[PDB]
Amino acid sequence: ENNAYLRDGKSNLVSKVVELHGETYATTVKMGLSKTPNTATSAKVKIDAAYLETYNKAHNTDFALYPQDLVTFANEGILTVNANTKSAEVEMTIRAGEGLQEDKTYAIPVAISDQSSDITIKDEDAKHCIYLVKDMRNAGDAYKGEGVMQGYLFFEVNDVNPLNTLSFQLENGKLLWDVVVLFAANINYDAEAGRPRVQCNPNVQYLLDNNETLLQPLRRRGVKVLLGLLGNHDITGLAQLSEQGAKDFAREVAQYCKAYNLDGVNYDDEYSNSPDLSNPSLTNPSTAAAARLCYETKQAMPDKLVTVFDWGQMYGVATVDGVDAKEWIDIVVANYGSAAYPIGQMTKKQCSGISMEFNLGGGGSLSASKAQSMIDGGYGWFMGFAPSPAKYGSVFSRLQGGGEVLYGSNVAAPTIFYKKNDPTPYKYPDDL
Numbered sequence: 094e095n096n097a098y099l100r101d102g103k104s105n106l107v108s109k110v111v112e113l114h115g116e117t118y119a120t121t122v123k124m125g126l127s128k129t130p131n132t133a134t135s136a137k138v139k140i141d142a143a144y145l146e147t148y149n150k151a152h153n154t155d156f157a158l159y160p161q162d163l164v165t166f167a168n169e170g171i172l173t174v175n176a177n178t179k180s181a182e183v184e185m186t187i188r189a190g191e192g193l194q195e196d197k198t199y200a201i202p203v204a205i206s207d208q209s210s211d212i213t214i215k216d217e218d219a220k221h222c223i224y225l226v227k228d229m230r231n232a233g234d235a236y237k238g239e240g241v242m243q244g245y246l247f248f249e250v251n252d253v254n255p256l257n258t259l260s261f262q263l264e265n266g267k268l269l270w271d272v273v274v275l276f277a278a279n280i281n282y283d284a285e286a287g288r289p290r291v292q293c294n295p296n297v298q299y300l301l302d303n304n305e306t307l308l309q310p311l312r313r314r315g316v317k318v319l320l321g322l323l324g325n326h327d328i329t330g331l332a333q334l335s336e337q338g339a340k341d342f343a344r345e346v347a348q349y350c351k352a353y354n355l356d357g358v359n360y361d362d363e364y365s366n367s368p369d370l371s372n373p374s375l376t377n378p379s380t381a382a383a384a385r386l387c388y389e390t391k392q393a394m395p396d397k398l399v400t401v402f403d404w405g406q407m408y409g410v411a412t413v414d415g416v417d418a419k420e421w422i423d424i425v426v427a428n429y430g431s432a433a434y435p436i437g438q439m440t441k442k443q444c445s446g447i448s449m450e451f452n453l454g455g456g457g458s459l460s461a462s463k464a465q466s467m468i469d470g471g472y473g474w475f476m477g478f479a480p481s482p483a484k485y486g487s488v489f490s491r492l493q494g495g496g497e498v499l500y501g502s503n504v505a506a507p508t509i510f511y512k513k514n515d516p517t518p519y520k521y522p523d524d525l
């Protein structure tokens with residue numbers, strides 16, 4: 094038995110989110126083999142539109158098929174076999190389309206076809222990979238180019254308007270913070286449903302109700318907006334859900350992201366109390382329960398970011414139900430003063446190389462030397478926590494010099510800030 098499965102060749106993921114920042118996107122589709130193939134081993138790939146119905150049902154999603162005429166495989170879709178790497182691949186090109194309605198994820202389900210008889214394909218999962226395509230050609234001001242480090246920013250939204258993301262621009266106009274987090278919605282026990290729910294304090298709820306004026310301006314400029322989830326002093330927790338409790342909590346998180354048109358979640362396993370082990374939705378707090386929640390959340394919103402703060406028991410188990418953590422931890426950010434590290438088949442591109450506590454001051458600066466050190470290490474991210482306009486002097490001083498290194502353009506001093514819950518751009522510092 095020579096077992097094959099399909100994955101994107103560049104990312105090595107069976108489910109790959111693709112962001113078009115240009116007219117074409119090129120990658121390979123890769124079939125892996127468990128055994129060395131023989132001279133006769135062969136297979137092809139094709140778009141499998143029928144499979145999308147099955148995929149959407151399995152994930153409770155509603156991705157529309159990406160126009161097939163915009164996808165082309167080299168070599169008629171035939172996979173070129175490399176027996177010395179137990180794999181076969183073909184180049185695939187995605188072209189940006191014409192009148193595709195924007196802010197919408199399209200699917201390219203890809204199937205192994207016409208495989209020789211020596212190849213076994215154990216199930217429909219092994220037979221397919223999927224690309225989830227988003228046209229980002231117009232949302233480019235957060236996009237600072239291919240291969241660069243990216244910013245990840247927490248707002249304490251009890252106090253600070255996330256439109257202050259827009260205060261942080263390079264001298265060339267690009268937005269520094271690729272990803273921002275609304276810190277935080279909570280996990281808490283709901284007695285009447287008998288399970289955990291998402292519980293939003295009035296500040297979080299106000300932002301969500303008013304996402305069109307206080308959040309969507311960011312997304313239109315390319316910023317990803319995540320809902321932060323945080324433990325909240327009861328029996329429920331992000332690292333103490335049973336398999337069934339995690340499946341349900343995961344669907345509630347995805348539903349928030351869909352309802353308020355957000356881009357994903359950050360899980361932070363802090364401030365929960367001991368679970369009630371008699372409850373079928375809870376279990377012993379463990380990094381394995383955290384990984385289960387991450388896996389289930391990614392299954393429920395596969396086009397959206399699943400990200401964790403590496404603290405508590407939120408991060409460290411690398412496999413759930415045979416699926417490696419690279420498929421369900423998009424970004425991991427570490428505690429102030431340290432670099433995140435990868436697990437399973439993740440790379441440092443999924444990892445923060447610095448975490449700055451902007452409100453209390455710990456964790457270093459995004460200096461020219463730290464920027465080069467992090468580039469040298471292969472790190473994908475820098476993280477900041479709780480900036481506020483009243484501390485812009487300290488915050489921006491901690492960003493001097495790094496932007497030249499990372500992007501060829503330093504962070505510009507701020508000239509705008511926003512007040513809580515107020516869409517008005519005020520002059521910084523005058524209007525403070």
Ligand SMILES: CC(=O)N[C@@H]1[C@@H](O)[C@H](O[C@@H]2O[C@H](CO[C@H]3O[C@H](CO[C@H]4O[C@H](CO)[C@@H](O)[C@H](O)[C@@H]4O)[C@@H](O)[C@H](O[C@H]4O[C@H](CO)[C@@H](O)[C@H](O)[C@@H]4O)[C@@H]3O)[C@@H](O)[C@H](O[C@H]3O[C@H](CO)[C@@H](O)[C@H](O)[C@@H]3O[C@@H]3O[C@H](CO)[C@@H](O[C@@H]4O[C@H](CO)[C@H](O)[C@H](O)[C@H]4O)[C@H](O)[C@H]3NC(C)=O)[C@@H]2O)[C@@H](CO)O[C@H]1O
Pocket residue numbers: 247249251252276277278279294323324325326361363364402450452453478479
């Ligand atoms: C990724 C990451 O960073 N993760 C964590 C972060 O969580 C952490 O952030 C800090 O967390 C602590 C702890 O937060 C938890 O516990 C809080 C306390 O709860 C307990 O008491 C409650 C009753 O008081 C009780 O109900 C509860 O059951 C507990 O027993 C919770 O309040 C908190 O939940 C709330 O916030 C979270 C989000 O943070 C929401 O999800 C949740 O729904 C809820 O709304 C959470 O469970 C916090 O205590 C820290 O908060 C301080 O700093 C943040 C900025 O980061 C501010 O936004 C806060 O307001 C707070 O600042 C203090 O604010 C007061 C009032 O404005 C200031 O007092 C004034 O002080 C001056 C002098 O200085 C004068 O005297 C004046 O008269 C006073 O009014 C005070 O100065 C402020 N202090 C500071 C330090 O600025 C953080 O949120 C961070 C830590 O770096 O990193 C990781 O660990």
